[PDB]
Structure 1
Amino acid sequence: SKYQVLTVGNPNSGKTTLFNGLTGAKQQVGNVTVEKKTGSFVHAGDEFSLTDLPGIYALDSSIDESIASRAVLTHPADVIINVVDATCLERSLYMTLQLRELRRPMIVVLNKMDALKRERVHLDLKQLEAFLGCPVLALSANNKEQVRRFKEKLHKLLVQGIALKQIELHYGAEFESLIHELEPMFAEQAVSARALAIRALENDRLVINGLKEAERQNVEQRQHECQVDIDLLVANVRYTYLHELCTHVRRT
Structure 2
Amino acid sequence: MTEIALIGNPNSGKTSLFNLITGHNQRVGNWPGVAVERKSGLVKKNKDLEIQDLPGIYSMSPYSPEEKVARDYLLSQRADSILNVVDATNLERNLYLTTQLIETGIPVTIALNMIDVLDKINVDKLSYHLGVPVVATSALKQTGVDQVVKKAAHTTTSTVGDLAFPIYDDRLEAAISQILEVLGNSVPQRSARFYAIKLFEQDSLVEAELDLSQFQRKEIEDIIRITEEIFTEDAESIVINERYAFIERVCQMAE
Structure 2 length-normalised TM: 0.84
Measure, in 1, the Cα distance between the counterparts of 2:139 and 2:207.
Answer: 36
Deviation, 1:151, is 4.0
Report the counterpart of residue 182 of structure 1 in structure 2.
Answer: 179
The 3-state SS of whatever aligns with 1:94 is: helix
From 39, 42, 46, the equivalent of 1:40 is 42
Deviation, 1:168, is 4.7
The 3-state SS of whatever aligns with 2:43 is: strand
Measure, in 2, the Cα distance between the counterparts of 1:113 and 1:15.
Answer: 14
Measure, in 1, the Cα distance between the counterparts of 2:30 and 2:220.
Answer: 33
Report the counterpart of residue 237 of structure 2 in structure 1.
Answer: 232
Query: In the alignment, residue 128 of structure 1 is paired with which amino acid?
Result: L
Q: Is the 8 A contact 1:84 1:108 kept in 2?
A: yes
- Whether 2:212 is the aligned partner of 1:212: answer yes
Report the counterpart of residue 73 of structure 1 in structure 2.
Answer: 75
Query: In the alignment, residue 92 of structure 2 is paired with which amino acid?
Result: E
- Whether 2:204 is the aligned partner of 1:197: answer no
Deviation, 1:203, is 1.4
Q: Is the 8 A contact 2:167 2:173 kept in 1?
A: no
- For structure 2, the 5+ residue unaligned runs are none
Shift of the 245–153 alpha-carbon distance from structure 1 to 2, 3 Å rule, reads closer
Query: In the alignment, residue 48 of structure 2 is paired with which amino acid?
Result: E
Q: How does 1:52-71 map to 2 (within 5 A)?
A: 52-61=53-62, 62-71=64-73
Aligned residue pairs total: 243
Report the counterpart of residue 112 of structure 1 in structure 2.
Answer: 114
The 3-state SS of whatever aligns with 1:17 is: helix
The 3-state SS of whatever aligns with 1:57 is: coil
Report the counterpart of residue 28 of structure 2 in structure 1.
Answer: 28
- For structure 1, the 5+ residue unaligned runs are none
Q: How does 1:118-133 map to 2 (within 5 A)?
A: 122-133=120-131
The 3-state SS of whatever aligns with 1:28 is: strand
Structure 1 length-normalised TM: 0.85
Q: Is the 8 A contact 1:6 1:50 kept in 2?
A: yes
Measure, in 1, the Cα distance between the counterparts of 2:15 and 2:192.
Answer: 30
Query: In the alignment, residue 169 of structure 1 is paired with which amino acid?
Result: I
Deviation, 1:47, is 1.2
